[PDB]
Amino acid sequence: SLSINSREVLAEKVKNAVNNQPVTDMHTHLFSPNFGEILLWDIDELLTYHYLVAEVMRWTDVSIEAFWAMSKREQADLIWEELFIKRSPVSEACRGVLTCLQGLGLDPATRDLQVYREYFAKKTSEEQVDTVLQLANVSDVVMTNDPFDDNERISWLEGKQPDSRFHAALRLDPLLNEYEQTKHRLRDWGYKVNDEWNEGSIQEVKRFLTDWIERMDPVYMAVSLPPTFSFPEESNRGRIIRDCLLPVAEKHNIPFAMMIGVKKRVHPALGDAGDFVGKASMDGVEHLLREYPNNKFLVTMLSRENQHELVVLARKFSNLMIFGCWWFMNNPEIINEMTRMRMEMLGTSFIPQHSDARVLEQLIYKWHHSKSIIAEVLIDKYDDILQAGWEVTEEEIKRDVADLFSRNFWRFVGRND
């Protein structure tokens, strides 16, 4: 019955447990460094992250065309001047760049971007991965692997495997969302899908999935979906999910990850910075969970206004695992409210965060900023049960922290450690 005797010691012990727990980051856009140039890293890549492109375009008089015509260094220079020098870098994405520099032993105080660049010029990808995963305390990274991308598909077809720290996830947007165009690529690749949606088309699409499952050994198959997402639906998407994806997933015991609420290309000229958000109906997700009890679903949603009801839906269905605070949700005010709602209604039965890192060094700030918030939530929740006379031990806190940052994910996808 030795246990934690005060809130101040609780806070110390929780913060230490959270900081020390190696993270599984279950959705990123990073790649094993052996995949080469598609692994993005360094300060110029940090600064030209699309979140920062959106932000600089609210201030700068430089036209979008002129921006895209600049070199990466020039874009980074402009972003630095407009968002850090001419106004204080108070936004979450700008703060994050500074957290990264500090983590790396660079000094934000000098504002010396040329000195920062020198740091990265002297390293290999493999070295930077080692440094960054250590600093961010991340043991495992789940990638986003898109067989429709020519520059990724090559490494796979060349027999490359990621190192043991990097795990595959099969990204299926082009197949589910753009089948009218994508069906022709499948044909080019020997999958004899017909004009008509018949048994032959069903079989060849299942074979496409099975071949990539065999190749990648993905931990889940994923898709991003619009605010209008509905299921069942008479559409290529509704048919592919019903006839191909769900049966394959069940057979292979692979979860289906759905990232719902992104409205694509509302400002096309902005590229990756041009996507918007909408509230979705919960009906399709509800139907999927109820009607496919032998399938597992990972869900994150983009609208603030979906988050509470998504937690309630998790209370209804054990084949739903909700994860992370995605994109426009990934800001302190929202991370805090979401994490509290989730813990109040689900206890520790969810995955509080993922980084969605596109640039390697972002693991540093995405985990630092989120861990501090998650630690605050845990401190309050433990203190409340301490107040109720419960005895919490440091071993129990370590166990719960491991569940939230790692074990709940592996347990749900039916694998590792």
Q: Confirm or reject binding of residue 101 to its own copies (CB under 8 A).
A: yes
Structure-token match 């660049």, residue found:
117
| Interface stretch with Cl ion, choices 12-20, 300-308, 367-375, 383-391 (CB under 5 A) | 300-308
Contact positions with its own copies (CB under 8 A) in 36-55: 54-55
Q: Confirm or reject binding of residue 89 to its own copies (CB under 8 A).
A: yes
- 262-263 and 320-322 strand pairing: unpaired
Q: Confirm or reject binding of residue 275 to Zn ion (CB under 5 A).
A: no
Question: What are the DSSP calls for 83-143, one per residue?
Answer: IIISS---SHHHHHHHHHHHHTT--GGG--HHHHHHHHHT--HHHHHHHHHHHTTEEEEE-
Contact positions with Cl ion (CB under 5 A) in 306-345: 315
Choose the contact partner of 356 out of Cl ion, its own copies, Zn ion, none; CB within 5 to 8 A by kind.
Answer: Zn ion
- Is 149 flagged in the annotation as binding? no
Q: Confirm or reject binding of residue 278 to its own copies (CB under 8 A).
A: yes
**C-alpha torsion sign, points 242, 326, 182, 145:** negative
Residue 302 is given by DSSP the state: -
Choose the contact partner of 230 out of its own copies, Zn ion, Cl ion, none; CB within 5 to 8 A by kind.
Answer: none
> Binding residue for its own copies (CB under 8 A) from 66, 198, 312, 415?
312
> Binding residue for its own copies (CB under 8 A) from 334, 394, 410, 416?
334
The vertex-71 CA angle with 70 and 76, nearest 5°, equals: 90
Q: How far apart are CA 246 and CA 279, in angstroms?
A: 25
Q: How far is the CB of 51 from Cl ion (least distance, A)?
A: 5
Between 81 and 286, whose beta carbon lies closer to its own copies?
286
Which token pair is 155? 């490494």
Q: How far is the CB of 305 from Cl ion (least distance, A)?
A: 4
Q: Confirm or reject binding of residue 415 to its own copies (CB under 8 A).
A: no
| Interface stretch with Cl ion, choices 46-54, 253-261, 338-346, 355-363 (CB under 5 A) | 46-54
Between 22 and 108, whose beta carbon lies closer to its own copies?
108
- Is 308 flagged in the annotation as binding? no
| Interface stretch with Zn ion, choices 110-118, 307-315, 352-360, 398-406 (CB under 5 A) | 352-360
Q: Confirm or reject binding of residue 260 to its own copies (CB under 8 A).
A: no
Q: Report residue 301: phi and psi, to 5°.
A: -130, 150
Between 160 and 315, whose beta carbon lies closer to Cl ion?
315
- Is 150 flagged in the annotation as binding? no
Smallest CA-to-CA distance from 346 within 377, 389, 303, 373 is with 377
Task: Provide the CB-side half-sphere exposure for 161 (13 A, CA).
Answer: 7
Residue 403 is given by DSSP the state: I
Please state whether the peptide bond connecting residue 232 to the residue before it is cis, i.e. omega within 30 degrees of 0: yes
> Binding residue for Zn ion (CB under 5 A) from 146, 275, 356, 361?
356
- Exposed/middle/buried for residue 331 (C-beta within 10 Å: 0-12, 13-18, 19+): middle
Between 176 and 301, whose beta carbon lies closer to its own copies?
301
Q: How far is the CB of 321 from Cl ion (least distance, A)?
A: 17
Q: Confirm or reject binding of residue 54 to Cl ion (CB under 5 A).
A: yes
Between 201 and 306, whose beta carbon lies closer to Cl ion?
306
Q: How far is the CB of 211 from Cl ion (least distance, A)?
A: 34
- Is 354 flagged in the annotation as binding? no
Between 356 and 400, whose beta carbon lies closer to Zn ion?
356
> Binding residue for its own copies (CB under 8 A) from 7, 12, 22, 59?
59
Q: How far apart are CA 73 and CA 77, in angstroms?
A: 6
Residue 239 is given by DSSP the state: H
**Is-contact 195 208, C-beta < 8 A?**
no
The CA dihedral of 101, 104, 107, 111, to the nearest 10 degrees, is -30
Q: Confirm or reject binding of residue 398 to its own copies (CB under 8 A).
A: no
Q: How far apart are CA 217 and CA 8, in angstroms?
A: 45
Residue type, 93: A
Q: Confirm or reject binding of residue 272 to Cl ion (CB under 5 A).
A: no
Q: Confirm or reject binding of residue 276 to its own copies (CB under 8 A).
A: yes
Question: What are the DSSP calls for 25-42, one per residue?
Answer: E-S-S---GGGGGGSB-S
Q: Confirm or reject binding of residue 4 to its own copies (CB under 8 A).
A: no
Q: Confirm or reject binding of residue 119 to its own copies (CB under 8 A).
A: no
Please report, as ranges, the residues that interact with Cl ion according to CB under 5 A: 54, 273, 305, 315
Mark the binding-site residues for Zn(2+), compressed into ranges. 27, 29, 333, 356
Mark the binding-site residues, compressed into ranges. 27, 29, 333, 356
